[PDB]
Amino acid sequence: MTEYKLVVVGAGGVGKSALTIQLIQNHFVDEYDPTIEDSYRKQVVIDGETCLLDILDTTGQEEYSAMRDQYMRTGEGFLCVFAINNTKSFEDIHQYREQIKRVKDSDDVPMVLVGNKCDLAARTVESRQAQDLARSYGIPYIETSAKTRQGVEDAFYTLVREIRQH
Ligand SMILES: Nc1nc2c(ncn2[C@@H]2O[C@H](COP(=O)(O)OP(=O)(O)NP(=O)(O)O)[C@@H](O)[C@H]2O)c(=O)[nH]1
Numbered sequence: 299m300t301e302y303k304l305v306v307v308g309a310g311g312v313g314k315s316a317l318t319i320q321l322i323q324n325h326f327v328d329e330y331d332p333t334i335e336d337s338y339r340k341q342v343v344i345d346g347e348t349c350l351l352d353i354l355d356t357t358g359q360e361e362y363s364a365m366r367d368q369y370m371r372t373g374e375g376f377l378c379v380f381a382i383n384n385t386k387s388f389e390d391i392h393q394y395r396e397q398i399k400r401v402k403d404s405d406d407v408p409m410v411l412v413g414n415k416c417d418l419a420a421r422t423v424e425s426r427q428a429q430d431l432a433r434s435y436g437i438p439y440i441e442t443s444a445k446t447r448q449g450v451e452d453a454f455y456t457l458v459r460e461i462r463q464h
Pocket residue numbers: 308309310311312313314315316317327328329330331332333334356357358359414415416417418442443444445446
């Protein structure tokens with residue numbers, strides 16, 4: 299069937315893994331389990347098309363950038379994740395977007411900006427900021443809670459449709 303290689307990138311601890319588990323295994327981790335590189339493959343139906351998501355859950359460890367490039371070079375679509383309560387992770391979003399474009403040799407590669415943890419109250423990144431940033435990239439912005447599963451399906455599915463339209 300159709301295969302979509304989706305890549306989840308972001309700063310350490312933003313919720314990359316929790317978002318992916320919530321999509322696939324319908325539960326919230328709530329647990330310290332730092333990724334190195336994990337892969338998930340799952341047959342879905344999106345808008346009536348049977349497809350397979352091959353999802354690569356990367357790490358935010360700085361020590362691991364080359365491995366990230368190698369796996370990132372495969373991606374069709376990318377979720378660039380920060381946490382709405384961690385300004386640094388929002389700041390690091392620019393470095394991920396650029397590493398992605400060098401590694402993909404493209405400026406318009408499919409991509410969603412994801413503001414995770416919108417269940418939290420200690421918001422330090424206002425939504426208007428990320429909207430502007432996602433506007434300047436010509437990519438969508440979607441807020442997620444991996445805890446409450448809100449926006450999770452939205453964000454992946456929107457990437458899938460970004461990819462089909464490319
Ligand atoms: N409140 C809340 N906490 C979340 C959410 N998503 C993840 N967390 C919490 O934040 C921590 C990090 O989650 P994790 O998925 O491991 O992040 P990561 O980006 O994959 N980490 P790494 O880069 O090291 O692999 C965990 O304690 C997790 O439960 C969310 O949507 N809401």
